[PDB]
Amino acid sequence: QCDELVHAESKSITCKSEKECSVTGRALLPAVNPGQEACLHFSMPGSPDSKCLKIKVKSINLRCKQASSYYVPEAKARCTSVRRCRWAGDCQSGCPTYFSSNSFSDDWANRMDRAGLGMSGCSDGCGGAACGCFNAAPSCIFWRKWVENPSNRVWKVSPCASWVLAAIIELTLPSGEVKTLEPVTGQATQMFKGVAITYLGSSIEIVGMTRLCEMKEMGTGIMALAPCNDPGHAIMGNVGEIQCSSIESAKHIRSDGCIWNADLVGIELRVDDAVCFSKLTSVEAVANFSKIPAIISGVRFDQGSRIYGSPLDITKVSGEFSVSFRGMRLKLSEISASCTGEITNVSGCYSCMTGASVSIKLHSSKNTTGHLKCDSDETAFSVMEGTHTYRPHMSFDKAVVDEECVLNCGGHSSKLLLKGSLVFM
Amino acid sequence: QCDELVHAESKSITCKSEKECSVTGRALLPAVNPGQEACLHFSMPGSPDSKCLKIKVKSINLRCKQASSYYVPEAKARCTSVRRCRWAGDCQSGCPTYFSSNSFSDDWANRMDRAGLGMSGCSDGCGGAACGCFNAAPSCIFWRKWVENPSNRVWKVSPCASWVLAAIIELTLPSGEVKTLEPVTGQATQMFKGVAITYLGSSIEIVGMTRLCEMKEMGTGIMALAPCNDPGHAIMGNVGEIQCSSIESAKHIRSDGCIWNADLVGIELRVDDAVCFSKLTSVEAVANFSKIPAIISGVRFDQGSRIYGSPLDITKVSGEFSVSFRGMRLKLSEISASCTGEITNVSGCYSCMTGASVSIKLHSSKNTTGHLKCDSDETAFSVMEGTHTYRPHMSFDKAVVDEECVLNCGGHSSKLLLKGSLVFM
Amino acid sequence: QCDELVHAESKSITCKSEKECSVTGRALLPAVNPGQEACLHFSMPGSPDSKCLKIKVKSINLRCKQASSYYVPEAKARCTSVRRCRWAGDCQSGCPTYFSSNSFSDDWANRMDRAGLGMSGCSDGCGGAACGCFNAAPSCIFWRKWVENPSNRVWKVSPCASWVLAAIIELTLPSGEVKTLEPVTGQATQMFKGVAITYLGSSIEIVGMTRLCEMKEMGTGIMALAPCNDPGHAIMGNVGEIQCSSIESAKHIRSDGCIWNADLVGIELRVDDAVCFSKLTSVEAVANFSKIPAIISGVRFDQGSRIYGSPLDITKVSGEFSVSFRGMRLKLSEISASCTGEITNVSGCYSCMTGASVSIKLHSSKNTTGHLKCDSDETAFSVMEGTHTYRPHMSFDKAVVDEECVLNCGGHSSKLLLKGSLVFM
């Protein structure tokens, strides 16, 4: 493959603890993008020459570092009321003073788990013969609005407080052994006689991503990745507008284990009934729409029960290596790529998080990186030797695509035309 | 200009595919801040010496990577009601069972686009002669609260799911040709005989920026950058508390194309009228306050119809280059700057996103970077040769500014005094 | 200490302004993690050899770059009402038209700061003898719901719009002088005869952190770090659901200096009283739970009255240096560490922002970096020579810990067993 990646080569004197000093060769690879691979040939002065040491970055991924978790139900709004004339039942003298948001009337008809999350009260109703009462003073309306979880469906929700880079590299030793591993950052690792490699860290050009949260439906394990509320903040209109501290608490939305804002349910008292209004957000609908694998604005998120993100523009992440070699000379194998191509389609949505699909047929003499810069967006992707079609996603702002793009594949540049039609949503 | 920027210079043997091996000179520039420029002199063994290759970073900017878009109206709250005695009109037997949140009474007086977003209902009202009715049973109050867009003003809102770095570099070839371009990351670009340059990527020291969204007023194109709701989440108190899927849907806030939380409008039924309460957030007021260009906490945001951010502290972003040279010797031109200065003013706000303005008159023998570290904040900016006044922004926490600051300009350090007075908001 | 950190060493020709050209030695340290230290020995051709120049990264921290600030009260909900028969008091002809959300009834009993934030109104009540009135037409209910701050407790809230890296380095000159400083990024600093050092910047592998806000209780100075609302957006369920523009405005929640959503307080009118509902979020409770120092998902936040964050995985931040040396030879002192250890405990919470505590006893021949990779999480920490116990935090997803972990300490790897039990919350 033989990418040009070694950008410094040095000979330093290194000493242990009199003193024991010797010459160390060192080769610095400041920036290696996913898919790229270097080929390093070591020969001792006596020689011949080894097959090369190959150093490839397979991927540099984003791992979710979680905030505290909580559980959410698929909640449904319910309301009930019963009216008692003054001097009847509890209404001996108007609304009884104790009857408050945790109170339950025995006169109630509907589903009343007395342990469920909700809000009760009692209100004045009309009295007199006109409203079916002997006593003309106001009647009592004992009412409750609450939420239940009839489907027993529950999601564990874990906000991603940040994402952390995690590299996977692939090394081919001159013996031919292939090693695929997450390296230990900053620790020189002896690979074979006289040669050690240090992974010096990963870097990313993507700043301040939007807050996303892992969702896992319990007892089905199916995952989603979507916005959610901070733990303990029951803000209406989001996953997490109801939050529970256990699976069972969420299954039955228990008052003692769940929080909410009671305005999620509206109740309208009428003389002889009540009208219920749901302002609830369907958790199920959000998870349906947000299933993994998903492309969200330049990053593909996928599941291993942990979620990781892969930047789609592979030139926006890189890893750095240092190679030391003792008593050996280094030669680099470096070759340019012959690569040409044409766009065969653009299709999809505009002003959408997925971005449109750009279909690009390329022929390439070796594995390399394709770059596509348009006026709306720009991206890069790995290209395989031979002739193949690639479908990177790119973001456009309008239904009509008709613009100049520049394709750069292995240093060869051409001005392609992108034309197509895209939908909203 | 001649900044010290080449921090490694090497001579490696590079080979193609027997084998064809030759010596490649390589120069690594690990970190170049905006405004900085290197000067590289190449001479062949026979010589004289070329004018230099100049490599300057013009800017490293943040480009908005959008989430899905939506449209928002400048919404205004409306309410209406009509009361019908029992046995009159629809109220033949109390509130009719069908009359619900999408129902419209023909008895209504006010603006009723039956396609608009809103919520209807009917409620019991007082009956009898005391409330103007023959029948003593409860009357019916048919009511609706809704939102309209009388100004027809609409903004397209595009949340920025993340920001991505984008570099602009300026190269001066020994021939004197100046090239200003966004380079292709990771691809060696042949510049002139024997010399190629690779841009190895950009890096930024600013972590996890606050969520901002592009706003564009339709039919005026004027832009703003401000917080907003995630698409599909109609959280009250934010741009995006009402969201529409098209311009026309937003112009007339259509029920079929818009979402909201109906608690954005309050209605109070009285016997013979209703009181309307608006809890709406003015979109216009947010966009007014959030016009581009804007400084938001260390980053200047500006328009090209796309928005980009420029870190104001120019030492917090950098680009990395590698230069290869074949059959040539390299010499670096590097000069230090003579530079002194004094603070002439500090004015503005404290505890504000803009930060205060610090006025600094500097004299400098060459283009260089000024650094100002204070106890409250710290920044750096590009400085031009000659005598000029600069106005970097810095953040303070109190109305009274009276503190030690250190000014570093081209390696020369001095302890300046910052004194001034600032306002809240 | 003698870490392997110099990964390039070069000899370039550098020229001033005929021309004055000379040879400059340069040593590049691409990536130095906190706790690591290099030892550089300079000898002039005549020699002996200096004690070394030591270059250590003490810390690379995250500094909060603030949005605009605001003040929040510890708010408490209040309600009052008074009912006047028709033809009595203001109720001469029903609810008076002027009586609206800023109106105050002189008939009111409760705490009425007429300058406080709140919402008034008047509503129809029942008339006639049945409701204590001679006139049978509807009575008037004059009511108000508002918020007060009885404790006078106020927090200044400053959202962190982003976090910026700030490095502290420690240099030991051959003379033995120790210098601890924040370096000036990108400026070559002359250290001693012939030697200068450039700090080339900091880098971090943590992307897009969750929005946090500094909180400072006024008149106590005690700090917290917690989510909050954007300035000017009074979204219910968060710190900042009530926002004030001054300390005094927050102390008494003045209408002219504070904003809110009036649905934070509910009022239910009954015939002869009103029921008050608080939907307020206790600011005090959030600050209590969010006190500094706090570990939030991989970062320890601590106070200097400014807050800074320290990444706990020290291999996820690094600094870069360049050293120039004039007329001298360089030798590197580099030694590997002997280091072994065992896990002695894991205790704490799962699916929590703190993460569990893993207790690790290590013996090490020198200061070095310990790395612990488990299936749930992975971290690294600084290790001191000798035998010591370390307690890095790691995130697990389940109450039962029983998994393979790999410990890497100075290049020595061992597969440890992690077993323990953790709680939710």
Ligand SMILES: *[C@@H]1O[C@H](CO[C@@H]2O[C@@H](C)[C@@H](O)[C@@H](O)[C@@H]2O)[C@@H](O[C@@H]2O[C@H](CO)[C@@H](O)[C@H](O)[C@H]2NC(C)=O)[C@H](O[C@@H]2O[C@@H](C)[C@@H](O)[C@@H](O)[C@@H]2O)[C@H]1NC(C)=O
């Ligand atoms: C050339 O690239 C192939 C990989 O293509 C995949 O798509 C690329 C565009 C990019 O996305 C890359 O990340 C992908 O891996 C390599 O072959 C594949 O290697 C994977 C191992 O992960 C293996 O599962 C596939 O079967 C294999 N063949 C395919 C996809 O047709 C080539 O890798 C070399 O050749 C392979 C046969 C194997 O020996 C591998 O270890 C070698 O690196 C790439 N060519 C070269 C010369 O590297």
Ligand SMILES: *[C@@H]1O[C@H](CO[C@@H]2O[C@@H](C)[C@@H](O)[C@@H](O)[C@@H]2O)[C@@H](O[C@@H]2O[C@H](CO)[C@@H](O)[C@H](O)[C@H]2NC(C)=O)[C@H](O[C@@H]2O[C@@H](C)[C@@H](O)[C@@H](O)[C@@H]2O)[C@H]1NC(C)=O
């Ligand atoms: C010295 O810097 C000038 C630029 O000043 C601007 O402000 C700086 C403090 C910093 O913000 C920088 O980003 C700005 O560009 C250069 O001159 C300007 O170059 C721009 C090109 O972008 C041009 O539009 C201006 O007319 C020009 N003159 C000004 C602003 O007075 C100097 O650049 C060199 O000289 C120019 C005449 C041009 O030949 C340019 O290509 C050269 O780089 C800077 N001096 C040197 C020696 O580089």
Ligand SMILES: *[C@@H]1O[C@H](CO[C@@H]2O[C@@H](C)[C@@H](O)[C@@H](O)[C@@H]2O)[C@@H](O[C@@H]2O[C@H](CO)[C@@H](O)[C@H](O)[C@H]2NC(C)=O)[C@H](O[C@@H]2O[C@@H](C)[C@@H](O)[C@@H](O)[C@@H]2O)[C@H]1NC(C)=O
């Ligand atoms: C070995 O590390 C000691 C520091 O340990 C602390 O914990 C580490 C695991 C890591 O978290 C690190 O950041 C911490 O500083 C050093 O000694 C300490 O140095 C600090 C100065 O910040 C000082 O306050 C302590 O008293 C001191 N001794 C302790 C904690 O026992 C060693 O530093 C060297 O030796 C010191 C005596 C001092 O001369 C210092 O300047 C030296 O660097 C570290 N050893 C070596 C050889 O560097």
